[PDB]
Amino acid sequence: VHIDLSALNPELVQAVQHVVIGPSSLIVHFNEVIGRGHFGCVYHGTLLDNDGKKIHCAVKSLNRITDIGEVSQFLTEGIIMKDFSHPNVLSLLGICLRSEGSPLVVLPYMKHGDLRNFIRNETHNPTVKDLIGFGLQVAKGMKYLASKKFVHRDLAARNCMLDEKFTVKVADFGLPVKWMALESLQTQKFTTKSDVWSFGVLLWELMTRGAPPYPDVNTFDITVYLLQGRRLLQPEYCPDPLYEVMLKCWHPKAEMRPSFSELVSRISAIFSTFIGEHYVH
Ligand SMILES: COc1ccc2c(Oc3ccc(NC(=O)c4c(C)n(C[C@@H](C)O)n(-c5ccccc5)c4=O)cc3F)ccnc2c1
Numbered sequence: 001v002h003i004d005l006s007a008l009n010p011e012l013v014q015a016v017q018h019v020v021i022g023p024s025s026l027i028v029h030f031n032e033v034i035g036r037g038h039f040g041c042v043y044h045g046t047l048l049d050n051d052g053k054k055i056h057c058a059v060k061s062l063n064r065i066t067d068i069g070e071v072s073q074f075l076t077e078g079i080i081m082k083d084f085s086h087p088n089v090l091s092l093l094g095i096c097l098r099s100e101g102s103p104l105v106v107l108p109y110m111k112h113g114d115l116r117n118f119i120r121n122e123t124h125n126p127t128v129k130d131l132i133g134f135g136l137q138v139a140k141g142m143k144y145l146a147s148k149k150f151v152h153r154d155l156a157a158r159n160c161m162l163d164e165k166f167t168v169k170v171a172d173f174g175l176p177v178k179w180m181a182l183e184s185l186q187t188q189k190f191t192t193k194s195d196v197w198s199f200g201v202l203l204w205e206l207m208t209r210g211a212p213p214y215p216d217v218n219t220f221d222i223t224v225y226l227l228q229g230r231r232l233l234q235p236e237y238c239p240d241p242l243y244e245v246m247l248k249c250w251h252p253k254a255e256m257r258p259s260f261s262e263l264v265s266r267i268s269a270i271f272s273t274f275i276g277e278h279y280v281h
Pocket of ligand 1: 034039042058059060074075077078080083090092095105107108109110111113114122149161172173174197
């Protein structure tokens, strides 16, 4: 990959400068890979400050980026993400624009990987309170994203990260038909309200500790399934009030679905009635 960086806009390069990091502070370990491949090509990285203090990071290589339009789009995404600041939203440490090799994205290292794999791992023992707690953290992250008028589009357990303090970081914001709202499947439109539907599916994943949704329904038969008024069944470990929350999230009419603000207050109330946790945040 040899991108001709000279062909970029002065005001945009000026705009992205506060997001750019490079070899004077970032060490990429190109021989050391992170993850399976559901986050793409990711390397272990080390970020140093002025006094040489090291920080563990993940370095994603965007290998499919070739032309100047795609790089410009990449810079703008970097600019947007860098501005976000919320404990339940994954941070952007920076990006790398290099004359040789693909553009790079630098994120804080997430000890416990993604939430779906964490809860599926049988060596972990999350309580019902633990699972609801994870769901509350996601809702708080989505409440922030909504307040910035930013639509996630791909909310799911696989896309939520978990750090060493068991803080959930909403990630990969900005085909998973089984997470898509009815209107998104039909009109291809995505909004914060459709993010609320996906969040309902995410809660279902949590309470089933990462079971695949709609097991007996084909991906192409999902639109008719939902128009028939059929929904995901109540998980064995899901309480009645949380299941009603899920049902509200999957309302036929997008405008009738709760806001993430409403979701945080309701899930917070349910969470408070539960006791016993093995993962305290
Ligand atoms: C130990 O196991 C793992 C396994 C995987 C890990 C990991 O994977 C990633 C998670 C998330 C992302 N990236 C994102 O969530 C991005 C978001 C949300 N945006 C922003 C959006 C507006 O496009 N961008 C982006 C930023 C700048 C330019 C273009 C795109 C992004 O890369 C990249 C990763 F490797 C990150 C950190 N620790 C990990 C530990």
